[PDB]
Amino acid sequence: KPRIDMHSHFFPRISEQEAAKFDANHAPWLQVSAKGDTGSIMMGKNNFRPVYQALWDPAFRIEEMDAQGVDVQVTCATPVMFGYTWEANKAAQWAERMNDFALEFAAHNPQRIKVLAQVPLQDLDLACKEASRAVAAGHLGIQIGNHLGDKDLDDATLEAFLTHCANEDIPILVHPWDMMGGQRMKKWMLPWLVAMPAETQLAILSLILSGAFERIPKSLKICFGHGGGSFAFLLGRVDNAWRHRDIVREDCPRPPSEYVDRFFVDSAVFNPGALELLVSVMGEDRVMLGSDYPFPLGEQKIGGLVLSSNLGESAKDKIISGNASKFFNIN
Amino acid sequence: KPRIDMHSHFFPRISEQEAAKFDANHAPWLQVSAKGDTGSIMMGKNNFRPVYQALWDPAFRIEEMDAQGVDVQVTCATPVMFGYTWEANKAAQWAERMNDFALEFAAHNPQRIKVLAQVPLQDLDLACKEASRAVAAGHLGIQIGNHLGDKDLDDATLEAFLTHCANEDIPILVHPWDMMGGQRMKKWMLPWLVAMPAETQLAILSLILSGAFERIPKSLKICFGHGGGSFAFLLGRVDNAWRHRDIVREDCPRPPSEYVDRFFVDSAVFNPGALELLVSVMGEDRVMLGSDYPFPLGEQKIGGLVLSSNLGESAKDKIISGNASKFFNIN
Ligand SMILES: [Co+2]
Ligand SMILES: [Co+2]
Description:
12 helices, Metal_Hydrolase (chains A, B), decarboxylase (chains A, B)
């Protein structure tokens, strides 16, 4: 019955000086206001996002984990630090620095704080090395964006990197980023409410419908962020469109809704009816408690939705604890 | 207990000659293969989509409605014919021609076939006239795309056109079209499975979060196509993000999940767990049987999902019959 939060974010103590070493416009860095209890993520010289002390001060973060019942948390890089847009070596150097930063982070109570490494996904080689280097170095797995410009998970680049980690028993977190839309969704944080779930839901079908779960070893432990996005809902549509149009069946040989046993999703759906539906489509043994701590939109009572539910008692424990522990190899 | 299908599509007997009158590249037209039992929608000279005889031959369509139990169907223009991209008068002339075509269509058994008019939404004036002209001419309401280039339903143009129809008791169907994504979702009909639900779900929040349901008279009967898209699922997230970020609350003064009494959705979700969830968020009196007949992805047993459900007996009738009849004023 320890409680494991497995989606969560961090950001390292990088000065504006160090970030200009890599790119004075597109590297990010952390800027603390005098007090040391607020601050903002900065893109070169612009204000990207306000954040608060939980995102860099792990000592503070353990106090908070105590006040929510979180025994073990898993953190990992904030989407922004991914820089998949960059030159392929500077990025592989950037990523080795972060996973190094992140490792000192969990080095504050590594029995409680577990990290997940980012990669330089543009070059397929660098990333395969970076991921096995940083999983031996300490991490429990890798966190990647769900798409690479116009390359979704179907692209053989990303299939390859997956099939590498399936073999090395390197668990994988896929996290939406670099949202679609272009111009239209500018106001009200729409990009987080419509684009983001849609991006994850796209990433999943980009495997099932490309038939990648037929070529990728069944060892692959892969989880998708924000409850799979609008998936467990839109599934019924995908099955229907596969029963009825040839060119949907083209490379997917079973009915899509059969591959719900090849991946996992977290619980971050924020609604007890949503969660029920989500579990029935995924199976009580494939949904894992995540919170998206500390960002503003991630349930401040971590676990609350899961325990304020109708769910069974075995189920509740599997999400909270079981599933995540089997997933990451936590004792 | 008559059964009313209220989402459905048609396309008129337009020759390639007539379509060049308006645009030899972007007007569409219907081309029948010799037999008169198959054919294809054509953009000038390209093959847009294959279709089958149900989409133009209403005599045939009544035979089919007999073999599904459909007593009254409501059809309306196929997204493609919208031409919101066009010069503003040619479009208002195009639209008056279609709603005229469509009227002869339902003029085959108008006690069974009911139509819904399209508009030239780019010019706000033309459309307000076109819509009251064609609702007196015979139609039961208007069907519009959910967005206008980069203008979503929040844009005051489209708020205005809504507030006009709320007053004239002109019911409204919002149908996704002109999907987002740009380049990435090219293969496997992804655009129908990820973009399309996302577009409808965006259109709905573009009202709630803009606060438009506060300025728009409560008379407004408006329905959203394809079960609201990934809405009833992602709602829990929207509420959460409104409880927690100021700039989401900026123009929305109640918690978003309260406006589920200002619109309706059809049933086209294709999964009994999806439908259950959809009804609980919308209320048995706000979900209406639709089928997306005849396009390939619209359940060939019309009503099957609704009656193959756990739902109550009053509920089942309200979706099938009740709600739609109150919605369109059908006796
Ligand atoms: Co996150
Ligand atoms: Co449709």
